[PDB]
Amino acid sequence: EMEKEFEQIDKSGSWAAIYQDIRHEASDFPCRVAKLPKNKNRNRYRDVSPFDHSRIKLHQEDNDYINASLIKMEEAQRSYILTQGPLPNTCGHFWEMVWEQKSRGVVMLNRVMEKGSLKCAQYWPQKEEKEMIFEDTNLKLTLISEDIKSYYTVRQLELENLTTQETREILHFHYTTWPDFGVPESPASFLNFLFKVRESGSLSPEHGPVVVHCSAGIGRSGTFCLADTCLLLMDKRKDPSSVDIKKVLLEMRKFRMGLIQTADQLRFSYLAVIEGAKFIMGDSSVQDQWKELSHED
């Protein structure tokens, strides 16, 4: 049971050891496509690749490769697409994947510039009047509106298939204050953001899998999906005791390497799930309290 286990690990000071055992137990599957010489410029990080079995295939034609994985959580019945922050030459492929996979929401957990370096291309338009046209993949993208909060922004985008003239609405949830190899400021601030995402309808099974990315699409991304999946699992069952967090994380790591990148992100995951279980188990009031504690205005 997660809270008792939490207290025990904390007491004995063993988060590093718990987290290293997850790393040693994690699946190791090939990534031969990601490593094809022709794909080298499609990859942000040498050592972060999608497994071949789980990779998202683009429906071109010339090169179906994108660094994106489908994390398909069978028992939870939710999927997520985890991807690296798009590169200057992969922004058209990224929107192509969103279109082909029928995603309604993209959760971005990083900034474009972190620590002085460019960790993600500016893949969405920051002004209504300056849309983006991705000529390679025949798509256009328009900022429709944005809602700017203290630590996150929600943007409404319109994606258009230029070939068919079909248009879809895409919600962009942008967490701007989650440091790389770091944790959110509090469980409240993380949960307030997660439930904004849930509220939008973007995780509905009527839509394709939500796209989640940070820079490498593994540490901040894995932290997000983990907490969400664990909360979903206990909601299904109405039973917090039935959720084994480390097991869920190991199941996720069958689909993408390196999910959750520090011991403290693991520890933060347990805090978020333990705190969010209050909501799942019937205390609707805590939602209002997370909003306050998050200082979103």
User: Which residue's CB is nearer to Cl ion, number 193 or number 279?
Assistant: 193
**β strands within 131-243, DSSP E:** 132-134, 139-148, 152-161, 167-175, 210-213
- Report in angstroms how near the CB of residue 201 gets to ligand UN3 at its nearest: 26
- Catalytic residue from among 31, 91, 120, 214: 214
Query: Could you tell me the smallest distance in angstroms from the CB atom of residue 119 to Cl ion?
Result: 7
Distance CA 182, CA 179 (A): 5
Q: Which of 42, 78, 104, 111 binds Cl ion (CB under 5 A)?
A: 111
- Selected from 11, 13, 32, 47, the binder of ligand UN3 by CB under 6 A is 47
Q: Is 148 in contact with 216 (CB distance < 8 Å)? A: no
- CA-CA-CA-CA torsion for 90, 91, 97, 103, nearest 10 degrees? 150
**Which amino acid belongs to residue 199?**
E
* Binding partner of residue 111 among Cl ion, ligand UN3, none, CB cut-off 5 to 8 Å per kind: Cl ion
Site for ligand UN3 in 92-111 (CB under 6 A): 110
CA distances for 168 relative to 58, 156, 158, 211, 224, angstroms: 18, 10, 6, 15, 25
Q: Which residues contact 63 (CB under 8 A, 6 or more apart)?
A: 38, 39, 42
The one among 107, 214, 225, 226 contacting ligand UN3 by CB under 6 A: 214
Does the annotation mark 214 as catalytic?
A: yes
Which of the ranges 101-109, 175-183, 185-193, 267-275 carries the binding residues for Cl ion, by CB under 5 A?
Answer: 175-183
Q: Which helix (H) or strand (E) holds 23?
A: helix 15-25
Piece of the chain touching Cl ion by CB under 5 A; list 73-81, 117-125, 147-155, 196-204: 117-125
Residue type, 251: E
- 3-class secondary structure, 108: strand
The answer to whether 153 touches 111, Cβ cutoff 8 Å, is: no
- Which tokens belong to 195? 């439930």
Q: Which stretch binds ligand UN3 (CB under 6 A): 3-11, 92-100, 214-222, 269-277?
A: 214-222
Min dist. Cβ of residue 296 to Cl ion (A): 17
Residues 113-172 contacting ligand UN3, CB under 6 A: none
Q: Count other C-beta atoms under 10 Å from residue 236's C-beta.
A: 14
Residues pairing with 268 in the sheet: none
- The mark string for 222-261 relative to ligand UN3 (x by CB under 6 A, - otherwise) is ------------------------------------x--x
Q: Contact with ligand UN3 (CB under 6 A): which of 9, 22, 31, 48?
A: 48
Helix ranges restricted to H, 78-218: 91-100, 187-199
Out of 9, 143, 218, 230, the only residue in the binding site for ligand UN3 (CB under 6 A) is 218
Cα separation, 44 vs 33, whole angstroms: 15
CA atoms within 13 A on the CB side of 289: 10
Smallest gap, in angstroms, from Cβ of residue 263 to ligand UN3?
14
> Using the rule CB under 6 A, is 20 a contact of ligand UN3?
no
Query: Which of 114, 160, 251, 275 is the binder for Cl ion (CB under 5 A)?
Result: 114
Which residues of the shown chain bind ligand UN3 in the complex (CB under 6 A)? Answer: 45, 47-48, 110, 180, 214-221, 258, 261
Where do contacts with Cl ion occur on this chain (CB under 5 A)? 23, 111-112, 114, 116, 118, 121, 179-180, 258
Residues with a known catalytic role: 214
